[model samples]
Target: YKSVNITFELDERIDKVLNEKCSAYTVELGTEVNEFACVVADAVIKTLQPVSELLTPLGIDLDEWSMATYYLFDESGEFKLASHMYCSFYLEHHH
Candidate 1:
């Protein structure tokens, strides 16, 4: 597994919301993006547990490292859905 660290400013309220949501799902904060992404993906699966119809097709595990690197890009990459979805979800839920 690979790990990288990054720090970015976030609004106080949004930060609190992130902490709450992550905690509710047993996700650790203040770690490498790759680690966080894996945790978040797990959380996503857990959250969707109620909907048994949805399935993660074989060999389709979340790519935390690449997703993290994509978010770290100077210019957004083509596969920006993950990053945008997280940010937008946070904003919508918090504000």
Candidate 2:
């Protein structure tokens, strides 16, 4: 599986909110960062190709768009697996 590491630096108030919101998934009170990061990374990877395709024909490049999409929806979304697969095939065979 692919993996990514991310760090978030938050102020005390924002940290408190994050801690409370993400507490259930945490090992302790504020250490669910890795778990959160993994979830976000998976979502991004899953949606990458479709997002790339949508952007590509509008004067965007897949390689560049993929990276942008990674940062765009790093929080939540369903894995667009079919779209990703279709776009990957299209890009590979057509261009």
Which number leads on TM-score?
A: 1
The residue-by-residue lDDT of candidate 2 on 49-90, one tens digit each, is: 555556555564646433432211122322221111111111
lDDT of each: 0.33, 0.32
TM-score of 2: 0.26
Collision pairs in model 2:
none
Q: lDDT, candidate 1, residue 4? A: 24
Name the regions of candidate 2 deviating beyond 4 angstroms: 1-31, 57-95
| TM-score list, all predictions | 0.30, 0.26
lDDT of 2 at 65: 30
Tens digits of per-residue lDDT, candidate 1, 1-95, equal 22322222223333343444543322233445444545554544454354334223422233431233222211242212122223222222221
